[PDB]
Structure formats: structure tokens, C-alpha cells
Amino acid sequence: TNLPRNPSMTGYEARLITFGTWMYSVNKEQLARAGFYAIGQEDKVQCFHCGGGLANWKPKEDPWEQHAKWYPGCKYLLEEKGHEYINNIHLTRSLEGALVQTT
Amino acid sequence: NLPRNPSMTGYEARLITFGTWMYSVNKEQLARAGFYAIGQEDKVQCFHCGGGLANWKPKEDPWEQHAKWYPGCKYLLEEKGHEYINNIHLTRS
């Protein structure tokens, strides 16, 4: 409801190290900063906070953008990027404390 | 108070589950109404209240069905409001 699904991955370094032999086109530092950590299955990653998983990354994709696109309800995303950023990603305008759930 | 399937809180996350949706009800409307397909025929579930719906018929409105069957859903309440839910059940003056 507010606490992260994987508190042991709250720190940047803890997440970064999971991308040991990261052989994919998406920057591991950007992924870690965006709250993602690798789960050891191809290029599959999950957010330490909302638990949202993402796979099949394409070259030059922005982790934060994908995070906001697929998991707009993430509290980590909200606290770090803010409501304005999330709304812009979804090309809309929502209310002050309203989650982007319908578009 | 808290969604049953938080990973389906986002519109796109729900929409994609309707990959090859061939049924009579529009998948965008279903997703907007909080529903996502479970990969079993036309079975769908609300990400918030967890209410499931199946055997969709042409011309049905996902929001109306959501309100009819699961009036207690908090997502329905927050998005549509009391007045809408009451009208669906005609519960009013």
C-alpha cells in the first residue's frame, strides 16, 4: 500500500550489481536508476517498489519512460518523477492526487 | 481501499492483455473500465475489485456491466461516482 515489494533492492548499488553481465542494448545504469533490477532471466527486470516487470527491451528505450507507460501507479515513479512527468508520458492531464488509470 | 492486482493499475498494462481480442465488446472500453483479459475465452477481471465477467454480448457497455455486477468496486466509485452507480441500479428518486 506504500511499502516496496522488494526492500532489499531499495538502494541503487544493490540493483546495479544484479546487471553483472548485462549484454543488452539498454543501459544498466539507467535501468537501475529507474528502480529496476535484473532477475536473472534474459533481459527481464522488475521494479523494487511496485514489483512491475518488464522484458524485451528495444534499443534506445528510456527506462523511466517505460516505467511510467506501463506502471503509472508506481509510488517510486511518483515520488521521483512527479505527477506532471507521468501525465506527459500518457499525453493527458489528471487531477492532483489522481492516478493515471483510464488512459 | 487497495487494488487486487496492482500490476494492472495502468491502462496500457490492461489493454495489452487483449492482444487478439476477437469478441463483440471493444477491448479499449473494457480496459478503460478497469478490466484485463485472463487468457481464457472472453473472461476478464477488474484490476481493483477482482470481479470477473464473462459471456459478453454485443452492444454491452463495460462500465455499465461493471456497475451492475460489482457496485462495491472502489475503482468504479472513484472514476464514475455515486450518481452513476445509483442510476445504473435506478436506486434514486
Binding site: 512491475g52 516487470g53 518488464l54 524485451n56 528495444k58 528505450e61 | 498494462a13
Partner: peptide, 4 residues
């Protein structure tokens, strides 16, 4: 990317 796409959700798992």
C-alpha cells in the same frame, strides 16, 4: 519493452 513489454510487461512480463
Amino acid at each position: 519493452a513489454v510487461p512480463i
